[PDB]
Write an enzyme that holds these catalytic residues in place. Structure first.
Site, PDB file in Angstrom:
ATOM      1  CB  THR A  80     -19.455 -63.252  10.974  1.00  0.00           C
ATOM      2  OG1 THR A  80     -18.996 -64.216  11.930  1.00  0.00           O
ATOM      3  CG2 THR A  80     -18.689 -63.425   9.670  1.00  0.00           C
ATOM      4  CG  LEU A  81     -18.182 -56.962  10.697  1.00  0.00           C
ATOM      5  CD1 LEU A  81     -17.294 -55.749  10.454  1.00  0.00           C
ATOM      6  CD2 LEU A  81     -19.362 -56.600  11.589  1.00  0.00           C
TER       7      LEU A  81
END
Lengths: 232, 224, 245, 242, 233, 242, 230, 230
Positions: free
Chosen positions: H1-2
């Site tokens: 998850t950036l």
């Protein structure tokens, strides 16, 4: 032949360690004695030829600055074990900045032995008996380890061919209160009785770790000459 | 846990390879004949028992456009080696862009067959292969044994009574014959050893144009 | 130890393959596959394989089944040791799913049988693994709308058939199927006739009257490509149509 | 000679090692599962521990569960069965991780059957020595009981017994249909069958050698072991009957 | 036997595979090494078919590195692979330390490899004994003899191979500590010719000094063989 | 237990012998003869073919003598499939040495590499050894013309003339009687034909069961010739003239 | 049975694993150990093996965690491996979480470790039996075996000549629940003495329980208890 | 998850006389887009433990699945009610998960509240646990109640009240001013409603549609969600 290395006997004994316990009976005789002043390890050097360099074969070695050891059985396997002990003792000293306990060194040595069992790499037992003497925070002490992996602390002990007579003489003549000089005299008298020789210099090897410097000391011709002249 | 199940006997023999050859010698017979303008491979079978699909049990198979293969021995081993040989020919074509030379395919499959006589925990392949094809260097007929040995043949047989069929071919074969003469010789050699009358149903023939597998009516027209 | 492992005996035989085929024969389960003009049928005996445990009365008899789905359209019957047969069903399903993912279209019966036999050959060649004692029939409909029926054994030998049996009797059941098919020589009529021929072939081979509760029948056709089991009531009606002359 | 490896067929097409496993299981402690009108009842009789007097009371329990709604028990070696039960719990965990719903019972039974079967294929792995019962009950679907044999065979039952004396237990259980008998009434019958079947069991060791569990309406269709207050009058009535 | 234990303990406590390796050593050609003040002499038996076999090809006296050399007795191919491993370790030490490998280090390494092959699954023991002559870090010369078991010891003079005991008891009664070069080659030649046939084609003798290992020319061996013929009559 | 089926191929005998190596040597000794010798002009290899049938394609087929590199060639005695494996590996090693150093491999180094491969199978693992012995001939600038003889053990030796396979002792006898140092190409070829005739128990040598090849350096370029039946027939009639 | 006792993965015709049975047979040659409990405490006692006059006694009981200790009977190297595994599991639970490990979970993990070595032909069963004493909300005594089984006991004993100790425990089990700590120590020492005199050197003795971490009893207190027993 | 895409806003948990009261609005925003307005952001772990999140919804759902299987595996091994994992155990587990993921530079973009009742001595809800089917409240000492915070970097602690997101400024000021021990349910509700009112007026990502969850002696109770009064 037919039994794997990990096969149990019907009595609940591993076949290979039982067989390896026959190898330790062979070799040259050695004795260790522990007293309050320190620990002494004496050994006979059965020199096969006059052409051999006498100092090249070492029956007493230093696992560390504060640890000495006498080996019996298969000498190459013994040197393998002692090299591992030296490496792990130096690793302990680097990691903790102190001298390792004698019991811890003996325990890791006996952990390397029986590595072939693969419970958690060597292929077989080591077939080596070691008398590991040293001086730690709890004073001098002497331990005995064998191919089964059992460690046993001893006030006095013997290994090699004349283990039985050596331990009989040690049992007769050892006292808990004797001094360092009396301990040297006891060790060399036991080696004299069990040997088939006149007990000259370059016929026995002597080392000691005392509670004054806690340093391994390999004896020289003057020291064996002194103790031999002191012998009755 | 990996050790060789094929081992040298006291007299230097590899008995497992001998036994694979024994299995080959009991299996149904196959043969190949190289003619001056082509090469054919033939084989026979028991008559179908009115239920089995004949087209689903072809022993002669196409490897590539000008390479076909037949075998005598174990069918599952044949399917595995056939798939591997198709993969190897495709690998060559990916590398060099042209169809695989027959000799290179034969050498690769010979090495693969050898590997199962030495690698641990396996048995040798229970079959003998015959690989026929054409390339720029001409027409080729190659035998491969269970051992991994390979032989460059002009004509041969690799199964039941193959000594008798080889003697028949030795008397009949000539270095310069037409494809029709070779097909006639192949059919006669097959029906000689067969017990009873050899119908069209008991014959498969492939001929190397691309590699062709003959139809039943063509075999019957040859059988007149 | 030549007979213990999958290695050659002096006669060139792999006796482990023969003994695995004997293990398949020992189950005393008969399955029969038939091909129609645009359909294929499998019938099986819906009995527990003869093994250490015998049939308990509290055993749920509807749960017993030698017929399985590999995909929606391909199906099979599997006769042999039940654990081996279940493992082979899972292997066939995995092969079919891998084919569908890699190639984007559904595998056919022939390619499935050939992949399964490729898996079986590894057991026949590698000493360290046991042969699966499981014989199998596979049915489907190919892209050309013609029915496929294929059969494989523990040796790894795939073959297509107009009709076939996995059971204790061979060369007599073959004669029964031969007689029925030569006697035989609309899609609904084809389906009904093929189902009747499969049921009657099993009845003649087994040599006793079949109860609809103790047989399982499954069918593929161009009318319904999905491999589906017919109901017990339909099988009972088909059995009634036998012996009514 | 052919009975020295699970990965070798004997000339008559049999794997003798699996048969010896069956012999091992048939000598072990008894387990049974029984479908009832309102639930399934599971009972494990540990008759082998009648000799050991110092074992803690009701510490040994062969009845386990998965997802709080599937009972899983066994007859055979404890360690192998713990391995199988750990695999069952892992399969349930993976299924819920993938799909966010609990594993269906038949899928779990198939997967555990394949896991058991895989150890009967190779020359270097010991096959599992345990028969495994896996069961569940629901309001709509009623009871589903499965027995997985050491060979990988899985079969569905309305009631099943494995281990020692299973023939006598099966004969006594077969005397009447339990799908129209509640679990509370069934406990008395199970105690009577134990007293009549297992000769080591008696009145003085029924209370501490027998594990009981069920999934029924009273437990909200979830796992529970029978409290002492429900067990004591039932075994008292069984002893008075016997 | 990818990792199967090949060397195991017999019921009496012996390792029979090591004993069989020793038997293989006893069949091999005889080698002798003799020490002096600042040089050593190594002599090895060689047998070749006259007029057909190339005598240069079989080197049993081998230069391991700048300053160490090796004789061996036993299986030749095992000797080749172990010698190549030793050469690799010599250059690895000289990479890691920037000083040439001492003889004691090399002998210890060879003994370690032999012991390891007696104590690992899926490997046969090395069927060879070796005599390693070389110089210590303090420039003292030494000869180290190693066995298949992995035991090693330093020797003033030693022999390995077939009939090594007779050569050993000869060298005990004829070794005289520091010696000139000519008498040292003479002692080595007569010692090996106690068991070996007395001809110049049956022996290869070399002399190790600090600068290099120099193989004695065949004329000197011929002359000394004639002298040994003379003294025996 | 699979160790009951393990023959322990890499295990010593009581006499310090590898039994599998000795049996591979026995296999080699039963194979057809391969002779090698060195002339002033270059190296000669000859061999007696195994006659299976007259239908073998004898046009450009050589089953005993093989090219490893433009300056290295070899003659086989033993199993042909193992020989093909090791010949392919030798070709790989020669071209690997040319890749790494931009110069052709000395013949001794190739012999050392392939013999190391042979020794590894005797020391490592549990596989049988290669049942082949090579006569590797070649030329290099540092050592001139060379002929080595290998074995299943990985032992190798170097020869001016030798023989392997069946009747190798009588071939060696004829070679030591007749071979000499300064000899020409024609003289060496006639001696090779004589040795093949003597070892094959034939007064006249037949061209149809002789493979004969030679390597020679001219203009600083190495050239290999594999004689056809026509050229061999010419040499046969020349041999009968003498 | 010589055919079927050769590898650990072979079942005999009677459905027995003979190598695992031999690993169990290894346990009876160890020196005797006894463990009992009351409502509040677990007391473990053991006979320390002494192999000669000049030897020191072999250690018999070991600390795993603040409220967990063990005694062993069988091959001591296997016991050392299991001891290190248990100590690492306890300290890892105290590291990841801030609580003591569940004793049942620890014993199950040890039993899984036992069982995993019985499955493969390249492994052997641990030839050692552990008795595990702890206080985790109540006194608890567990036993592990080479076959991967485990059990929980009100009183336990095993080793050489442990049958007499078992008989004494069978007689005196009903007293232990209401016994005080001193009476519990006396009962455990008497049960150990039935197996044989005892000495401060040759007698390992430890206690764990409520508000009482695992503690070896000191030599002077042990001397007092041994005097009271005699 | 950036980074976060679908975000949950603040969560507020407090101790009161009968247990834990934890509150969160039912909104998940896609940036400035109030896409989802009936989302659940307080998850039941077990009968005495609940979890709430602020930040990315996907990471929170992944953590919720992890804690769900942890609870199921805990139930599988349970034999008595004391074996059930406590809220502090789950807090330590979540802190370790966040710490390891921080070390991998793969964080869960969340701030997590783990709240519940540490003690088993108030009820027998864990003797017979029901996962698939749901007298007066007992007064519980605050020492037996637990509320714990975790952030992205694994910074973990506990307190008598915890806030996440924008509640760390708006709600937490009023909590530090006005919180007192042993509040009734009505007082806790009034304080929480005041905090959520301020957040509704000043947090643009906040909603007036509240979910309240109570952890008490009768387990975890999800109150019917309501619009903020007035």
């Amino acid at each position: 032949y037919d039994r794997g290395v990990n096969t149990f006997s019907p009595e609940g004994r591993l076949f290979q360690v039982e067989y390896a316990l026959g190898a330790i009976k062979l070799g040259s005789t050695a004795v260790g004695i522990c007293v309050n002043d320190g620990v002494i390890l004496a050994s006979e050097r059965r020199i096969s030829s006059t052409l051999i360099e006498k100092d090249s074969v070492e029956k007493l070695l230093s696992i560390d600055d504060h640890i000495g050891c006498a080996m019996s059985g298969l000498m190459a396997d013994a040197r393998t074990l002692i090299d591992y002990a030296r490496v792990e003792c130096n690793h302990y000293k680097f990691i903790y900045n102190e001298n390792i306990n004698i019991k811890s060194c003996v325990e890791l040595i006996s952990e390397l032995a029986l590595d072939f069992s693969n419970l958690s790499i060597m292929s077989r037992p080591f077939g080596v008996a070691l008398l590991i003497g040293g001086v730690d925070k709890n004073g001098p002490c002497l331990w005995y380890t064998e191919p089964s992996g059992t460690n046993t602390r001893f006030s006095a002990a013997s290994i090699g061919s004349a283990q039985e007579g050596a331990e009989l003489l040690l049992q007769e003549n050892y006292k808990k209160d004797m001094t360092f000089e009396q301990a040297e005299i006891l060790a060399l008298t036991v080696l004299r009785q069990v040997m088939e020789d006149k007990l000259s210099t370059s016929n026995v090897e002597i080392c000691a770790i005392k509670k004054s410097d806690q340093t391994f000391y390999k004896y020289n011709t003057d020291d064996i000459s002194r103790i031999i002249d002191v012998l009755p | 846990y990996s050790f060789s199940l094929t081992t040298f006997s006291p007299t230097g023999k590899l008995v497992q390879i001998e036994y694979a050859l024994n299995r080959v010698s009991s299996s149904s017979p196959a043969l190949g004949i190289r003619a001056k303008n082509g090469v054919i491979i033939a084989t026979e079978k028991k008559s179908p028992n009115e239920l089995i699909e004949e087209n689903s049990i072809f022993k002669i198979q196409q490897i590539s456009e000008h390479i076909g293969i037949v075998y005598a021995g174990m069918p599952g081993d044949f399917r595995v080696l056939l798939k591997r040989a198709r993969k190897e020919a495709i690998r060559y074509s990916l590398q060099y862009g042209s169809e695989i030379l027959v000799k290179e395919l034969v050498k690769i499959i010979a090495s693969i067959v050898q590997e199962f006589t030495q690698t641990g925990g396996v048995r040798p392949f229970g079959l003998s292969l015959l690989i026929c094809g054409v390339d720029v260097y001409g027409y080729h007929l190659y035998q491969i044994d269970p051992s991994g040995c390979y032989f460059n043949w002009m004509a041969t047989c690799v199964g039941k009574d193959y000594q008798n069929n080889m003697s028949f071919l030795e008397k009949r074969y000539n270095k310069d014959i037409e494809i029709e003469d070779a097909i006639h010789t192949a059919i006669l050699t097959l029906k000689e050893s067969y017990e009873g009358v050899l119908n069209e149903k008991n014959i498969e023939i492939g001929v190397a144009k691309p590699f062709k597998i003959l139809t039943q009516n063509e075999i019957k027209d040859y059988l007149i | 130890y030549d007979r213990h492992l999958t290695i050659f005996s002096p006669d060139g035989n792999l006796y482990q393959i023969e003994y695995a085929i004997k293990a398949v024969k020992n189950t005393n389960i008969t399955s029969v596959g038939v091909k129609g003009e645009n359909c294929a049928v499998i019938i099986s005996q819906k009995k527990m394989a003869t093994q250490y445990i015998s049939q308990d009365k509290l055993l749920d008899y509807n749960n017993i089944t030698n017929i399985y789905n590999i995909t929606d359209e391909i199906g099979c019957s599997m006769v042999g040791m039940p654990g081996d047969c279940l493992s082979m069903v899972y292997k066939a399903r995995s092969e079919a799913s891998e084919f569908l993912y890699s190639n984007g279209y559904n595998v056919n019966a022939e390619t499935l049988c050939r992949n399964i036999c490729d898996k079986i050959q590894v057991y026949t060649q590698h000493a360290y693994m046991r042969l699966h004692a499981c014989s199998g029939m596979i049915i489907g409909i190919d892209e050309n709308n013609k029915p496929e029926l294929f059969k494989f054994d523990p040796s790894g030998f795939c073959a297509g058939y107009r009709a076939c049996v996995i059971g204790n009797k061979e060369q007599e059941s073959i004669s029964v199927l031969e007689r029925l098919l030569e006697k035989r020589k609309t899609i609904d009529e084809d389906i009904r006739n093929t189902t009747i021929l499969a049921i009657e072939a099993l009845q003649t081979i087994l040599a006793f009257d079949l109860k609809a509760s103790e047989i399982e029948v499954a069918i593929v056709s161009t009318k319904n490509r999905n491999f589906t089991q017919i109901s017990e009531k339909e099988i009972d009606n088909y059995l009634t149509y036998i012996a009514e002359r | 000679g052919y009975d020295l490896s699970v990965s070798t067929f004997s000339p008559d097409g049999r794997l003798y090692q699996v048969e010896y496993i069956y012999k091992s299981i048939n000598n072990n402690n008894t387990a049974l599962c029984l479908e009832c009108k309102d639930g399934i009842i599971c009972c494990c009789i540990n008759s082998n521990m009648d000799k050991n007097k110092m074992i803690k009371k009701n510490s040994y329990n062969r009845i386990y569960h998965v997802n709080n709604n599937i009972i899983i028990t066994y007859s055979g070696f404890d360690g192998d069965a713990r391995n199988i039960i750990d695999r069952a719990r892992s399969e349930a965990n993976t299924y819920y991780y993938n799909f966010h719903t609990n594993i269906p019972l038949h899928i779990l039974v198939n997967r555990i059957s394949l896991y058991i079967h895989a150890y009967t294929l190779y020359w270097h792995m010991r096959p599992f020595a345990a028969s495994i019962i896996i069961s569940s009950f629901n309001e709509k679907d009623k009871g589903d009981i499965y027995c997985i044999e050491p060979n990988g065979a899985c079969y569905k039952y309305s009631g099943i017994v494995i281990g020692k004396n299973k023939e006598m237990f099966k004969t006594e259980i077969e005397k009447k249909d339990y799908k129209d008998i509640n679990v509370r009434d069934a406990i008395e019958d199970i105690y009577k069958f134990i007293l009549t079947s297992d000769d080591h069991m008696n009145k003085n060791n029924l209370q501490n050698l027998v594990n009981f569990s069920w999934i029924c309406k009273e437990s909200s269709y979830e796992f529970q072991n029978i409290h002492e207050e429900i067990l004591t009058p039932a075994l008292n009535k069984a002893v008075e009957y016997i | 036997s990818y990792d199967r234990a090949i060397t195991v303990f017999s019921p009496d406590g012996h390792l029979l595979q090591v004993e069989h390796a020793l038997e293989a050593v006893k069949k091999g050609g005889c080698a002798v090494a003799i020490k002096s003040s600042n040089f050593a002499v190594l002599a090895v038996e060689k047998k070749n078919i006259p007029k057909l076999q190339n005598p240069k090809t079989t080197e049993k006296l081998i230069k391991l590195d700048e300053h160490n050399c090796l004789a061996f007795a036993g299986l030749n191919a095992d000797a080749r692979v172990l010698v190549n491993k030793t050469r690799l370790e010599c250059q690895r030490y000289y990479l890691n330390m920037d000083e040439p490998a001492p003889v004691d280090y090399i002998a210890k390494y060879v003994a370690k490899v032999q012991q390891k092959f007696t104590h690992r699954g899926g490997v046969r023991p090395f069927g060879i004994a070796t005599l390693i002559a070389g110089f210590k870090n303090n420039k003292e010369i030494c000869i180290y003899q190693t066995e298949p078991s992995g035991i090693y010891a330093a020797w003033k003079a030693q022999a390995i191979g077939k009939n090594a005991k007779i050569v050993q008891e000869f060298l005990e009664k004829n070794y005289q500590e520091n010696m000139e070069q000519k008498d040292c080659i003479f002692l080595a030649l007569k010692a090996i010719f106690e068991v070996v046939e007395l001809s110049s084609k049956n022996v290869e003798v070399a002399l190790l000094t600090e600068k290099d290992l120099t193989f004695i020319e065949e004329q000197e061996i011929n002359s000394m063989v004639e002298l040994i013929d003379q003294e025996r009559t | 237990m699979a160790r009951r089926y393990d023959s322990r191929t890499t295990t010593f005998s009581p006499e310090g012998r590898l039994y599998q190596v000795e049996y591979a040597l026995e296999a080699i000794n039963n194979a057809s003869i391969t002779i090698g010798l060195i002339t002033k002009d270059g190296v000669i290899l000859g061999a007696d073919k195994v006659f299976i049938s007259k239908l073998i394609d004898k046009a450009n087929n050589y089953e005993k003598i093989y090219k490893i590199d433009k300056h290295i060639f070899c003659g086989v005695a033993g199993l042909n499939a193992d020989a093909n494996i090791l010949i392919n590996q030798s070709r790989l090693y020669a071209q690997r040495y040319l890749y790494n150093y931009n110069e052709v491999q000395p013949v001794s180094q190739l012999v050392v590499q392939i013999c190391d491969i042979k020794q590894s199978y005797t020391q490592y693992g549990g596989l049988r050894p290669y049942g082949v012995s090579f006569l590797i001939g070649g030329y290099d600038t540092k050592d001139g013309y060379q002929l080595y003889h290998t074995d299943p053990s990985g032992n190798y030796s170097g020869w001016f003339a030798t023989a392997i396979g069946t009747n190798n002792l009588t071939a060696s006898s004829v070679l030591k009687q007749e071979w000499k140092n300064d000899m020409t190409l024609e003289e060496g070829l006639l001696l090779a034909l004589k040795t093949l005739a003597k070892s094959t128990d034939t007064e006249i040598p037949k061209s149809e069961k002789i493979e004969l090849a030679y390597l020679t350096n001219k203009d600083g370029e190495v050239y290999q010739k594999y004689l056809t039946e026509k050229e061999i027939e010419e040499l046969i009639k020349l041999y009968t003239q003498k | 049975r010589n055919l079927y006792d050769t590898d650990n993965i072979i079942y005999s015709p009677e459905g027995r694993l003979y190598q695992v049975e031999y690993a169990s047979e290894a346990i009876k040659q160890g020196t005797c150990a006894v463990a009992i409990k009351s409502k509040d405490y677990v007391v473990v006692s053991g006979l320390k093996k002494c192999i000669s006059k000049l030897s020191f006694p072999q250690e018999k009981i070991f600390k795993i965690d603040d409220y967990i200790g063990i005694s062993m009977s069988g091959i001591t190297s296997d016991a050392k491996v299991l001891t290190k595994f248990m100590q690492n599991e306890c300290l890892s639970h105290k590291f990841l979480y801030n609580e003591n490990i569940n004793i049942e979970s620890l014993v199950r993990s040890v039993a899984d470790k036992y069982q995993k070595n019985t499955q493969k032909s390249s492994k052997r069963a641990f030839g050692v039996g552990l008795m595990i004493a702890a206080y985790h909300n109540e006194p608890c005594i567990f036993e592990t075996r080479p076959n991967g089984s485990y059990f929980e006991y009100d009183a336990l004993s095993f080793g050489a000549r442990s049958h007499a100790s078992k008989t004494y425990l069978e007689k005196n089990l009903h007293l232990f629940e209401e016994c005080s700590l001193e009476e519990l120590i006396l009962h455990c020492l008497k049960a150990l003495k039935c197996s044989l005199e005892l000495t401060i050197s040759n007698t390992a003795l430890a206690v764990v329980g409520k508000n009482h971490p695992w503690q070896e009893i000191s030599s002077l207190q042990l001397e007092e208890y041994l005097s009271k027993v005699k | 998850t950036l980074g976060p895409v679908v975000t949950g806003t603040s969560v507020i948990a407090i101790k009161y006389k009968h247990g834990i009261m934890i509150a969160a609005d039912r909104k998940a925003s896609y940036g400035s887009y109030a896409k989802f307005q009936n989302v659940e952001r307080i998850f039941k772990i077990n009968n005495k433990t609940v979890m709430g999140f602020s930040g990315e919804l996907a990471d929170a759902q992944y953590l919720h699945e992890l804690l769900t299987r942890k609870n199921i595996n805990n139930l599988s091994e349970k034999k008595r009610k004391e074996d059930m994992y406590t809220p502090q155990h789950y807090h330590s587990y979540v802190s370790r998960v966040f710490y390891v993921r921080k070390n991998r530079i793969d964080p869960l973009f969340n701030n997590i509240i783990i709240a519940g009742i540490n003690s088993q001595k108030y009820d027998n809800n864990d003797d017979n646990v029901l996962l698939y089917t749901n007298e007066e409240y007992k007064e519980i000492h605050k020492d037996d109640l637990y509320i714990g915070f975790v952030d992205m970097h694994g910074t973990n602690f506990c307190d008598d009240y915890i806030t996440t997101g924008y509640a760390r400024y708006f709600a937490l000021t009023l909590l530090r001013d006005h919180y007192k021990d042993n509040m009734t349910e009505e007082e806790a509700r009034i304080l929480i409603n005041e905090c959520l009112r301020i957040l509704y007026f000043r947090d643009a990502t906040s909603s007036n549609f509240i979910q309240i969850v109570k952890v008490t002696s009768k387990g975890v109770e999800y109150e019917e969600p309501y619009i903020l009064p007035c």
